């Protein structure tokens, strides 16, 4: 399973998509995930949430003309979701956060 910061970042850069263990929130809900129940690993064994649009409401990440952002959960195994996320742009800037989008560090 590829779910680490470097592992997913390099996969994104090589393939321009997330590895096969990622599903979007709509897909997880279709499988029976309910936010707050912490049941993702029971309804979708070995899957992590990722691929949904990150809005960047707080302007913390660089904006550009026609640049949009997506997010993916990192280091997820089971139970309630953590605070680790990879946030990646349409032009392939890649940032990490370990505090649920409070702070960011550029890694690609």
Swiss-Prot record:
List, in alphabetical order, the Gene Ontology terms for molecular function in this entry.
Answer: RNA binding; RNA endonuclease activity
Task: Recite the lineage of the species.
Answer: Bacteria, Bacillati, Bacillota, Bacilli, Bacillales
Q: What is this protein called?
A: Ribonuclease
Name the principal localization, coarsely classed.
secreted
Disulfide bond annotation, renumbered to this chain: none
A single Gene Ontology CC term: extracellular region
Shown segment, full-protein numbering? 55 to 162 of 162
Q: Which residues form the active site?
A: 71, 100
Per the UniProt record, which EC number(s) apply here?
Answer: 3.1.27.-
Q: What top-tier enzyme class does this entry carry?
A: hydrolase
Native source species: Bacillus intermedius
Q: Which UniProt keywords apply?
A: Endonuclease, Hydrolase, Nuclease, Secreted, Signal
The protein's job, in short, is:
This is a purine-specific ribonuclease.
Q: Where in the cell is it found?
A: Secreted
Q: Which family does it belong to?
A: Belongs to the ribonuclease N1/T1 family.
């Amino acid at each position: 399973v590829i779910n680490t910061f470097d592992g997913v970042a390099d996969y994104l850069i090589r393939y321009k998509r997330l590895p096969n263990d990622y599903i979007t929130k709509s897909q997880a809900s279709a499988l029976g995930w309910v936010a707050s129940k912490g049941d993702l690993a029971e309804v979708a064994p070995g899957k992590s949430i990722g691929g949904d649009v990150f809005s960047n409401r707080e302007g913390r990440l660089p904006s550009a003309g026609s640049r949009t952002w997506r997010e993916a959960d990192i280091n997820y195994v089971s139970g309630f979701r953590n605070a680790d996320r990879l946030v990646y742009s349409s032009d392939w800037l890649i940032y990490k956060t370990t505090d649920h989008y409070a702070t960011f560090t550029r890694i690609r």
